[PDB]
Amino acid sequence: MKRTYQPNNRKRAKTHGFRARMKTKSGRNILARRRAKGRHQLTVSD
Amino acid sequence: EAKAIARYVRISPRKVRLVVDLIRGKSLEEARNILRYTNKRGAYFVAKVLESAAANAVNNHDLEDRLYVKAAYVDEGPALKRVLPRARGRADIIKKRTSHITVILGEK
Amino acid sequence: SSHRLALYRNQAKSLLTHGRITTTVPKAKELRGFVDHLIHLAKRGDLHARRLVLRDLQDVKLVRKLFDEIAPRYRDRQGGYTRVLKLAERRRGDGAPLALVELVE
């Protein structure tokens, strides 16, 4: 059926992961956004 | 005279309903074979709520036999709101309409 | 079809072994005649007869067991070598008035 979910450790991870977000302006942005703003955890945390 | 009961009773209030609506107001011992040898579920149950009934009395509510069921009833409540196939999109839940079960046992 | 038989089969089988089982109304009502019929063959008793009876049942032990064993205990009567008796209760959820049947004895 091929949905769109097949997760890929390697993938998903990579792609998304503390770092990256960081590395980025943007990413970083929102991130520290989320952080306070909301609490929670985060991607990679995932 | 005395009485038996029990809520949080999983079952078709309705169905149940037929149950008594039979053995209903009648000789103890007597129906005590109705539900013993009748059919549809509930029975089993129904039976039960007749024994702690006949009991309770004689025991703490007192003259055996000469007894019966001046009256018997069942109520629904608590539901069991149950989830089913998302309209293949939106949820469709039924409800095993919990089931109460009171029933009298007074002496002739 | 292939199922009607099968049944009669294993039922006919099992039974002869005990000679009175527990299947529902019908089920029994039939396993009778047949099984029954079969009997009447153990009675015939011989090359042929046996070559049939077995033909279905499939199994020396019995097959023989009955032809010799029981057969006799019956050599006299006129069919009926079975007494299909209904039963008092009923399998649950269901509510099927099962029943029991045996080789009239």
Binding site: - | L18, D21, L22, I23, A31, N33, I34, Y37, T38, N39 | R20, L85, K86, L87, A88, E89, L100, E102
Partner: protein, 58 residues
Amino acid sequence: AKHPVPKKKTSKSKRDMRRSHHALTAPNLTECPQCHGKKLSHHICPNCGYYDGRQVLA
């Protein structure tokens, strides 16, 4: 695909009325052969074994 569905709140009244023709009817049972008690009109039981032959237990 709901071509046809009710069209007007069924009316408790009626509704039930419907559910009306329904009703039970206690097992016609009789009384023991010698088993003494009430059995399923025509059968032995956890009281019998008899009928005419002891084909049961207890």
